[PDB]
Amino acid sequence: WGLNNAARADGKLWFGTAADIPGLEQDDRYYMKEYNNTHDFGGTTPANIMKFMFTEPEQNVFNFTGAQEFLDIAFASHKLVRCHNLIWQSELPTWVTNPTTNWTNETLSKVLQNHVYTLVSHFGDQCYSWDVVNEALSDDPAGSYQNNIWFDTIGPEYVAMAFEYAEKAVKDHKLNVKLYYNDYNIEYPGPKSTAAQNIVKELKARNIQIDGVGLESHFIAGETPSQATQITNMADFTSLDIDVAVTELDVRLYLPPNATSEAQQVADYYATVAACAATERCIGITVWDFDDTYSWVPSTFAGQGYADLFFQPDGPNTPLVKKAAYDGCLQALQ
Amino acid sequence: WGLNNAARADGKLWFGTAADIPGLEQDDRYYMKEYNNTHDFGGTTPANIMKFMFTEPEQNVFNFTGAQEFLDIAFASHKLVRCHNLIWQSELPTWVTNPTTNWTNETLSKVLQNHVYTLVSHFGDQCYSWDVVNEALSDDPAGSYQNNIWFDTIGPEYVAMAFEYAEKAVKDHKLNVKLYYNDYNIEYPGPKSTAAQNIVKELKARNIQIDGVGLESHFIAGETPSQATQITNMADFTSLDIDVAVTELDVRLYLPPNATSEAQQVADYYATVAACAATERCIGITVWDFDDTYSWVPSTFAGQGYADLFFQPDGPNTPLVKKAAYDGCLQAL
Ligand SMILES: OC[C@H]1O[C@@H](O[C@H]2[C@H](O)[C@@H](O)[C@H](O)O[C@@H]2CO)[C@H](O)[C@@H](O)[C@@H]1O
Ligand SMILES: *[C@@H]1O[C@H](CO)[C@@H](O)[C@H](O)[C@H]1NC(C)=O
Ligand SMILES: *[C@@H]1O[C@H](CO)[C@@H](O)[C@H](O)[C@H]1NC(C)=O
Ligand SMILES: *[C@@H]1O[C@H](CO)[C@@H](O)[C@H](O)[C@H]1NC(C)=O
Ligand SMILES: *[C@@H]1O[C@H](CO)[C@@H](O)[C@H](O)[C@H]1NC(C)=O
Ligand SMILES: *[C@@H]1O[C@H](CO)[C@@H](O)[C@H](O)[C@H]1NC(C)=O
């Protein structure tokens, strides 16, 4: 009995994990045995291979092969897939970021439209959902739109546009895929969360399909919003007639860990999972990978790490050790 | 003079250990030096390589190579082998769990029949025994059958079927292989143990061969059933005209160990081994690996470990340290 059995028993669609597949993880038999364990993981998200630079490496030249290897692997484990992501400021190829000739509203809008419509149409119902727009909102000022190539060139309309063209692809191919907005620092009430709720409201008012909001939940031990804080934040979204999901959960510490900060981690994993469990329309929890060995964290937040449910004290391709954080998740579901 | 010498002096067939071989353990010279120590280990069980996903990775395409590698390594240090296992709910290949079309009773039964019969036939008397069915019984409610792809599709009959088709193989090819049922939480009196006894009674009544029950004996320090409790429970099984074996013994603790929990561990290893020693038709004790470094425990139970007879304080590829638990086993014998 594991996290995914427990989550499905609580009415959730999955307990899930991201994985950086295709990749070195596939060469680690101890990692893969646990990835493939449907007791723990009934959902998954590709960490990288469906992002824009990998799927459209040159303008109008699509590459689906790595993404399809990921989907094939997921399917063999009966995992529902959160496809991630269509439009984001990061991991953009050079033809977008540094074009020989400058984009116009017209020309970049067409690039966005073609990228969205082709990826959604191509993969169809292999995806349970798409993260159609990722991280459109600023941290400063918190309410406002992020400055990025899409925003700067198209304006705020690029968000509605992305959902509109993803909707066109689902309608044109009679798909069931759900359309999500995904962001971080929207897991607690505040101007950024409110701004995300206003995106949902605006789309709904325009009869543009939007099914859910992804709450990334990249947290630091001790800074994580309380379970109660997450409960009321989740309710604010779901009252807009959408689902939510916890999409990228990990709870990083300042290295090295100690007894206090490990105890904080367990509490913060518990709080986030418990808040999902208390929320009728939170459809599931996904961790942003489950093995510290392969976690994005220590590359991205210097002097932080230890963020995942398992680790390998002897490195890649050696046995896993389950952390107390895992039990925090399981208890939250029971 | 080691555990296996002592067990054999007491009328047992072995003291044994599982090993996850082929694998990482083969690259640890201090691990393999002890594995190959026949003074301690005269029996072994493959932790993974003889399971369904490895031996029939696609339907009616068998792969025996890994298993044969295990058997060859075992033969080199004169070990008797508990081959493990034929039918089990877990560790099944995606051609069985994620079929192109739905299994029915008929089509799955033939999958079962074919797996069991070809593995038993193929390996013949390289195996002392097969765990023909593993873990058929539920914990909740304890009495009952476990829901799995075999039971859901084929019904309770899948158990008698597996043994029937194993018996066919032994009869066809004139084998000595013993046929075991193997399970956990049946090491003490209660509904699950009584249910496993009922399986044996049912098979015997229908003249299906069943030679033993394997008592996994994955215990927690201080929760292990007393020696006396194990002695009765073992007698309840052996009175049905079968053998028993202690098949997967380990005694895990909540980390870190302390003087009290380590003393409990020694007492619990002693109790289990001593119960087998007391029991004429308990044929041997196998531990579920012998080196903490490679134990299954830490990947499965958060905050637990230290379950085995040896550990390596300096990590993989460094010398083993023999724990007090080892002397508990020896003294029991
Ligand atoms: O906010 C954090 C960020 O995580 C992203 O995932 C990736 C990361 O972008 C990439 O460099 C690294 O190599 O892989 C990790 C996972 O292995 C995610 O796409 C974003 O939504 C999120 O913002
Ligand atoms: C995990 O599943 C994938 C997809 O079937 C497979 O390629 C891989 O070998 C599996 N690894 C395990 C079970 O260790
Ligand atoms: C397509 O992607 C695959 C794997 O990600 C890569 O090997 C190949 O070179 C890419 N480009 C192509 C096929 O043009
Ligand atoms: C645990 O780590 C945290 C974060 O670095 C620190 O604030 C705290 O003092 C540490 N406690 C110890 C070392 O006992
Ligand atoms: C253990 O025996 C096996 C099988 O003969 C052999 O391959 C291995 O080298 C041995 N290792 C030792 C004795 O350290
Ligand atoms: C030893 O460990 C056990 C189990 O965790 C615990 O109950 C007991 O209090 C510990 N005794 C000590 C530290 O002396």
Author numbering:
A (entry chain A): 2 to 335
B (entry chain B): 2 to 334
Per the authors:
The GH10 xylanase, XYL10C, from acidophilic Bispora sp. MEY-1 is an attractive candidate industrial enzyme that has remarkable activity and favorable thermostability. Among them, xylanase (endo-1,4-d-xylanase, EC 3.2.1.8) is a key enzyme that randomly cleaves the internal β-1,4-d-xylosidic linkages of xylan to yield different chain lengths of xylo-oligosaccharides. GH10 xylanases have a typical (β/α)8 barrel fold structure (also known as the typical triosephosphate isomerase barrel) with catalytic residues at the end of β-sheets 4 and 7, while GH11 xylanases display a β-jelly roll structure and employ the same retaining mechanism as GH10 xylanases. In the present study, after removal of this N-terminal sequence, the variant XYL10C-ΔN retained its hyperthermophilic characteristic but showed a 1.8- and 2.7-fold improvement in catalytic efficiency and specific activity, respectively.
To fully understand the substrate binding and catalysis mechanisms, co-crystallization of XYL10C-ΔN and xylobiose was also completed at a resolution of 1.7 Å. There is one xylobiose molecule in the open and extended active-site groove of XYL10C-ΔN, and two β-1,4-linked xylosyl moieties in subsites − 1 and − 2. Superimposition of the XYL10C-ΔN-xylobiose complex structure and the XYL10C-ΔN structure yielded a root-mean-square deviation (RMSD) value of 0.24 Å for all Cα atoms, suggesting that ligand binding did not alter the protein conformation. The xylobiose can form several hydrogen bonds, such as with Ala131, Asn132, His168, Asn218, Glu300, and Trp372 around the catalytic pocket, which provide strong binding forces to stabilize the enzyme–substrate complex and to maintain effective catalysis. Structural analysis of the XYL10C-ΔN-xylobiose complex indicated five key residues (Asn132, Lys135, His168, Asn218, and Trp372) that are involved in substrate binding via hydrogen bonds. As shown in the structure of the XYL10C-ΔN-xylobiose complex, the side chain N atom of Lys135, located on the loop 2, forms three hydrogen bonds with the hydroxyl oxygen, glycosidic oxygen, and O5 of xylobiose. These interactions limit the swing of loop 2, and further affect the interactions of the substrate and other functional amino acids. The OE2 of Glu175 shows a distance of approximately 2.9 Å to the side chain N atom of Lys135, which permits the formation of salt and hydrogen bonds. Moreover, the carboxy oxygen of Glu175 can form a hydrogen bond with the nitrogen of Met137 located on loop 2. Thus, residue Glu175 of XYL10C-ΔN, which interacts strongly to Lys135 and Met137 of loop 2, and is in close proximity to loop 3, might have the roles of stabilizing the substrate conformation in the catalytic center and affecting the catalytic efficiency of XYL10C-ΔN.
